[PDB]
Design a protein around this ligand. Sequence first.
Ligand SMILES: COc1ccc([C@]2(c3cccc(-c4cncnc4)c3)N=C(N)c3nc(C)sc32)cc1
Length: 376
Amino acid sequence: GSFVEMVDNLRGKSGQGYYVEMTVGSPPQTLNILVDTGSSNFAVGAAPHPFLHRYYQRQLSSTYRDLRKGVYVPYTQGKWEGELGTDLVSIPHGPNVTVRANIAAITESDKFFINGSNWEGILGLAYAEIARPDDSLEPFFDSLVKQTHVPNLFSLQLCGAVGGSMIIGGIDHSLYTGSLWYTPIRREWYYEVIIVRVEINGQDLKMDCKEYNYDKSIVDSGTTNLRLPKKVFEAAVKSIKAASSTEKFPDGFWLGEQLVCWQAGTTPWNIFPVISLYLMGEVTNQSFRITILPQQYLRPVEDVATSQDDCYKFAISQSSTGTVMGAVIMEGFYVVFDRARKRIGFAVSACHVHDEFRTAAVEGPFVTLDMEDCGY
Ligand SMILES: COc1ccc([C@]2(c3cccc(-c4cncnc4)c3)N=C(N)c3nc(C)sc32)cc1
């Protein structure tokens, strides 16, 4: 189970996440599982559902153990309920290991599963602090490290059109170019980070840096968009509108609700600005920036019916729960979740976004002598 054998182990559909193949139980039941750095439960469909092609059948697994504990998770956009237990788990295109792990067998859900996503469960890769029902439910990755010699790190290379790679236990140098820049993990719950500066087409938003991290900033492969706190979102939209003024779009487009379409191959990329997110470096008042092109923040919506054109959703949205550097931000970068060193690394990946004029980039270092602490 070498890193080369882990390459291209992810698949996905635009706006529906990225999934990896896993097996649960004995004999192994194959399931596609969403790779989620924004949550901490291993939760799998375990009962028929109109959007499930397959589900975990506990009665067919002779290694299943019921923990006699239920779990009820109402969340902002939906809900899932289930039963806790443990069973044997493997990642066929991951490390060459089998571990016993906690599994929440989802028995009922609302707005959780997606029509045609091709995934049947979620692999929450964040820390025990946000596990449900509480922190005593050991997350999968923690179990994996405890039971094997797998180093305490994984990396994600998410690619747009989807596919990509999840490298467990290491860094695959063939999936990135240039330097890998590290930002500290501020607290071990979500993958919390600090944004110290935001520019739109090189123009600083000029806010107190605490505004960018109101109330936390996270790296979440389980959220599609770049989600920004109200104040930040409003200033970002004003700036992107000023840059793209040669064309006027409905308020619906800016709300992330409606499509913007152009005749196939004519998307005016040049009228949309680049977004620079400056992340806190490993040393005092040093930072580095990741640059986000419109090829990332204008998410393409595949639909045979609209296929005479190239249609997109605006993949930046308002948040009341802090900044979320979602899938559209991670795409085109090689993101290293260095749990062992409490840091997240960013580098330009092989599948980075670019055109004839501009490219996604990871640049540093930048120094800021006039710096307060940017954390909330
Ligand atoms: C332990 O309980 C939970 C586990 C995961 C989720 C969740 C999620 C849930 C279902 C589908 C997705 C998803 C949908 N579309 C695209 N990507 C991921 C995300 N994963 C996230 N990162 C996330 N963020 C939300 C605001 S909901 C949600 C919510 C609850």
